[PDB]
């Protein structure tokens, strides 16, 4: 009945046969839309001599995964969880320059 036990049940169900190396689309032709944003914490340095810019940013990302879905009615009205980001698929967004 306790929320922790329900969360444990949900975690055990979610990652039963989850593969973090596979793109999370139900159909191969589907595209994963990634909502991308930046949020700058501070402008650390502008090195004019070396032509480099150092910034502290928050890289906000948001996408949909079709396998990580549940009905909150089956898990004590648990509506969202926090899990380590290295257990799931993530987009490989990199800074080019």
């Amino acid at each position: 009945e306790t929320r922790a036990h329900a969360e444990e049940r949900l975690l055990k169900k979610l990652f039963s046969g989850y593969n973090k190396w596979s793109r999370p689309v139900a159909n191969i032709s589907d595209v994963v839309l990634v909502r991308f944003g930046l949020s700058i914490a501070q402008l650390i340095d502008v090195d004019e001599k070396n032509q480099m810019m150092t910034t502290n940013v928050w890289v906000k990302q948001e996408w949909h995964d079709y396998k990580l879905r549940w009905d909150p009615a089956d898990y004590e009205n648990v509506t969202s969880i926090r899990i380590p980001s290295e257990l799931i698929w993530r987009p490989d967004i990199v800074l080019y320059n």
């Binding site: 190396w21 793109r23 159909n27 070396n50 320059n97």
Partner: protein, 109 residues
């Protein structure tokens, strides 16, 4: 997709794929690696300590006979993205580096 994750599981199944063994058949044949350097920026030349800094994309191509599959058996999939940390890689490094950074920076798929 279910088929994609089935294929990824089948290809990387550690029982039947050892990433520390060269993908050479027929005994002692050699694995040919194609190499190509692409330059993105010449970041700096530091004459004082004699070091050049570059941002390069190092294209590598080879053949791994253990990573084959039949498209008709996997929903007609022609290629897949595998993490490069879980397949065999040729240990190609910048041999004349300075500061001892032999390897690449990112390790993309």
């Amino acid at each position: 997709t279910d088929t994609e994750e089935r294929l990824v599981e089948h290809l990387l199944d550690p029982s039947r794929y050892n990433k520390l063994i060269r993908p050479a058949t027929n005994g002692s044949e050699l694995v040919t690696v194609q190499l190509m350097v692409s330059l993105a920026q010449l970041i700096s030349v530091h004459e004082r300590e004699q070091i050049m800094t570059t941002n390069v994309w190092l294209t590598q191509e080879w053949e791994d006979y253990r990573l084959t599959w039949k498209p008709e058996e996997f929903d007609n999939m022609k290629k897949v993205r595998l993490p490069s940390k879980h397949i065999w890689l040729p240990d190609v490094v910048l041999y004349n580096n300075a500061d001892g950074m032999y390897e690449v920076s990112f390790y993309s798929n």
